[PDB]
């Protein structure tokens, strides 16, 4: 699994220079998603004399 940071939020706002507080902003998402892995296999035979 791995992280997927989606979109940074809008944090600051350029407020007026009188108020004693900020103003909330939108958040960001991270979306911890996963993914699997496959396998590959097969076989093959032989005689023993017919290979010597």
């Amino acid at each position: 699994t791995y992280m997927k940071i989606a979109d940074y939020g809008q944090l600051g706002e350029y407020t007026c220079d009188a108020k004693c507080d900020a103003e909330f902003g939108e958040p960001g998402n991270i979306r911890h998603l996963e993914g699997k892995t496959y396998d590959y296999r097969g076989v093959f035979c032989f005689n023993r004399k017919n290979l010597q």
Partner: protein, 42 residues
């Protein structure tokens, strides 16, 4: 795979015998009276 693939991939070891199987006789030569000629008529 197994022997369904050509008769040319298997090199046969060539051994070094040689059967003859024929037959000669003995010889009555030494018994006969030896003699030596030089022309073609004596």
């Amino acid at each position: 795979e197994a022997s369904t693939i050509g008769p040319a991939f298997f090199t046969p070891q060539v051994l070094a015998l040689e059967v003859d199987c024929n037959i000669e006789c003995a010889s009555l030569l030494d018994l006969y009276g030896q003699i030596e000629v030089s022309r073609s008529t004596f």
